Symmetry: D2
């Protein structure tokens, strides 16, 4: 079927791309980077992240695959030596697909803007103090003061979420996790401190107290939004689909990345 | 139908119990503490915990209710002033039921012993050093050295799990969370550090490295087990059933307990 | 002697200032905000912080006093009701002085710039990834990757240092404490994680690995420095001098601010 | 002069001991394990710890040296290959001595008992809940509820203190650090959470609220004390003296143990 391949841009990732394309030339596979059904990422998890956001409007028609030319990644989790076996099983098809949950972020102004995140979305101040009221399912939960907040996907829990003390969630759990950044807790300002894991259909909204300008990141895209009235987090109805050609368990992927390999 | 009421044992909880029983006497309600369908706990979350383990072999035939004579609890979450309205709606029936996940703990010896936990199960050393190999789904994940480990239910995340840095999970998520106690991480011993959230059907097993004696707790029951070969954690197939007479959201219950009320 | 008074600028702090000045008019006290020997801060700890940096070149000739028109502060630690008793004991003199350690920050370019910090100095990235080599006493200690680093004074440990997990140090200890911000620790990048407390004459230097641009803060002053070659931290030879008119222990000040008052 | 050598008891540590003794036989050195002036520990930090407590009543007449037959230790910080160069410089004398601060622990009953700690002293419950009032310099600081408390020496900060989130202090700082174990913080029970670093002459006392029985550890000695009325912590007037034959900085020792070697 139709396929395309992105590359980190360095020498080793470009040459591995040209080899798979040539290998794909020996099968009924059409290269099409406009309406592809297979998207192969060669490089790292960041290269995978860019491939995800390049085709985030066609998520239900694509099965992603990641190849890591460097260290092992949680998304680019196949060694370059498996490329020739990869193009082989990709051309036959009949493979199985695995789906991971995504995070929807809505930004309301004085107008709206929606985004999808494969890892996490963070909110910080535009320079001054960061103060937001945290509203869970329309119930005011807390007034947060500190550096910022981070809402992570399940598979995103191994990224920025881990550095903030968040838990690692298996990606089969449809949920989202909220962690704090350098919260100030004293006699008069109190946060929950613990990370919070929210299930599907739970809406977490951040509302400004004074400053209405926040530096909002979604994966590696960080944009200063101005005159913000609300930031809404919830598990997305959309899922990212992976092509599965063998068994590489998430917990094993966690072990290899943080314990030793 | 059949019902029973447990009490913390102090004066205020005993008198509230006798009042509900007398109120129940005005309805078609038979007091039966052998095969009850309604179990009312009056006191605190600990009183609720004892009521749970008193009838853990009849979990599918019972809807639990907790009344807090002291501070608000996550299980005993109804004020004593709601007792007369409680006995009223309990007698009519037609109420809705809410189910929370439970944790199964299996202990293997040189023989087996199984337990159910409403909050958490912890493992510690019998005095010496605590060292276990952590095996997730038959894959060796890590060798843990430290004070001990804690596997928490979703609703149990607000108890001991919270004190160890674990996240707070909404109890509609069928999962279990593993946290570390004072892990030693250096050049040669490394743990994941982050809490781990496991979905249904994921089996986490602890295996001894040297000492085969561990102090194992299950909720408030702590027993020294000897000649242990394995400790297996997994989400239980059984669930605890609550009677729901109005709306008291979990996140609201979290706010009232840790932010302010 | 010579004195001056700064104010937060709001109504209550301005009027308390005019009252103390009028009270000072009944004594041999000359108002001089150019070469003062007494500097009174009325407002909050931030107002005190501005008063410190306004006269940081005359630190050895000044005894500072802070009055809090709002909540209790660690520097502005005297209630407005003590103002008339304050001006009284300040005019007589013969009071005792207390000294707190300060932090010296040196920035080297491709040129040098030095600063003094009463609370802390932080280093972060100019947008991209923050990576620095940490060199303690000319010995390379670690390569830090994460959000940033914070070096705190003893009295500054109750501010940003506390939010990052740092310890609270009694200000009679001449030392400085370094804490991490959202460090990434995996198989290939490892930080110490624990906060580090350095004594006098220990030099901690940060050196760039790739990006030479860092957003450096010193108390509430945050400046983007460009083409940076080194950042040097060490306990300053200078100390801030407080006027002591009664006993308000630091640990008591910690209790009142974080436990309850 | 007079000297003695302790050994871990395994084969490699025993043989290295007999070699140094034979090497000492070529010098004016008398083996005396009753009134030694040199105490050499061969094994690990635990072997060093036992050597410290074996001669804790003669601390001012002894210069300790540690040799690690296994991994590098913070006290046993000299490789076995340096033994022949060690016995050489030890016999000549004229070496320099380095002193580290120690922690004094006093236990009051309904009678008193005092102890010295090279690493730390911990207090925990005898099975039930651990609740103590924390009194700093006769001022009630907090009511602690949780697993227990740990007061660490400067050099002890790299041991149990590190696992609890405490900071690493350079041992030239005469101070002690208090850390919390799994504290419960909610609406009604609040602890400081942050570790606390106390200077010389600051007295930290723990007082029972209900249970008067506590499991108290001092380094590796753990004893159940009964009918306890008070536990007093303070920096000891005594110091441990090390023989210094070259330069092995503490921060370098920290790097080798936790970063990589
Ligand atoms: C892009 C990315 N996604 C990640 C993830 N889900 N878990 C761990 N690491 C990750 N990275 C590398 C930058 O943090
Ligand atoms: C018995 C109990 N269960 C709890 C829970 N699930 N969350 C918070 N607190 C709890 N308690 C009180 C003792 O910790
Ligand atoms: C200006 C300031 N200094 C502080 C300090 N040393 N400890 C706690 N709080 C402090 N504040 C208030 C802003 O954090
Ligand atoms: C006996 C000992 N003392 C230590 C110390 N001061 N720092 C790190 N590790 C240490 N050990 C080994 C057991 O934790």
């Amino acid at each position: 079927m139709k396929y395309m391949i992105t590359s980190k841009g360095d020498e080793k990732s470009d040459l591995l791309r040209l080899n798979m394309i040539a290998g794909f030339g020996e099968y009924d596979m059409e290269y099409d980077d406009v309406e592809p059904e297979i998207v192969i990422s060669i490089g790292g998890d960041g290269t995978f992240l860019s491939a995800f956001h390049q085709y985030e409007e066609r998520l239900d028609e694509i099965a992603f695959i990641g190849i890591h030319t460097g260290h092992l990644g949680f998304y680019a989790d196949w060694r370059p030596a498996e490329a020739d076996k990869l193009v082989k099983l990709l051309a036959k098809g009949e493979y199985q697909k695995v789906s991971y949950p995504l995070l929807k972020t809505t930004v309301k102004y004085g107008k709206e803007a929606t985004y999808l995140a494969l890892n996490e979305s963070t909110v910080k101040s535009s320079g001054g103090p960061f103060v937001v009221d945290v509203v869970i399912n329309d119930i005011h939960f807390e007034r947060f003061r500190g550096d910022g907040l981070c809402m992570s996907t399940p598979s995103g829990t191994t990224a920025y979420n881990k550095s903030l003390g968040g838990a690692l969630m298996h990606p089969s759990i449809e949920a989202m996790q909220l962690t704090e950044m350098a919260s100030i807790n004293n006699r008069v300002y109190r946060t929950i401190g613990s990370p919070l894991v929210f299930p599907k259909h739970h809406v977490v909204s951040l509302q400004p107290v004074n400053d209405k300008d926040f530096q909002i990141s979604v994966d590696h895209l960080s944009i200063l939004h101005r005159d913000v009235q609300e930031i809404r987090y919830e598990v997305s109805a959309k899922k990212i689909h992976f092509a599965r050609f063998r068994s590489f368990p998430f917990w094993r992927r966690v072990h290899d990345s943080f314990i030793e390999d």
